Assembly symmetry: C2
């Protein structure tokens, strides 16, 4: 008819626009995925740094409190053993 060519013109125009917009999206998404991949690696090693220091300091803390305790006990035993002789 008198419309049959103008039909494809507009259609082709659309496909080629959409495929512009989508190649654009795919690009913005590839970039965001790169940046998020890096953020994940960074957070993972920062989490590991805090965890490993936490567990190391927990061990020292256990060690000290166990000492402060055995020392606190021994000084109470001697101080009662003092007044029982005196």
């Amino acid at each position: 008819n008198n419309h049959q060519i103008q039909e494809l013109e507009s259609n082709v125009d659309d496909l080629l626009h959409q495929l512009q917009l989508l190649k654009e999206e795919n690009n913005r998404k590839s970039m965001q995925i790169s940046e998020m991949g890096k953020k994940i690696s960074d957070l993972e090693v920062e989490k590991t740094a805090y965890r490993e220091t936490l567990t190391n300091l927990n061990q020292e803390l256990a060690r000290l409190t166990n000492e402060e305790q055995s020392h606190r006990t021994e000084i109470f035993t001697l101080n009662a053993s003092f007044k029982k002789q005196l």
Copy 2:
């Protein structure tokens, strides 16, 4: 010519295939972005949990070591002050 219609047939076929493959990519990427967004939030709060415990235990550790030190000093001062009278 005798080629001019078969030309668009194959072309249109391509655009419509590519736009299939790209709508597919955009979908796989939207999903991966969702999962990475969540992983980032999870790692951020796990990092915070380790950091806040680390800083709390560091304070207790400082407190103990300062005590164990003032106690260790005082018991050396008294023990030298002992043998100087005796």
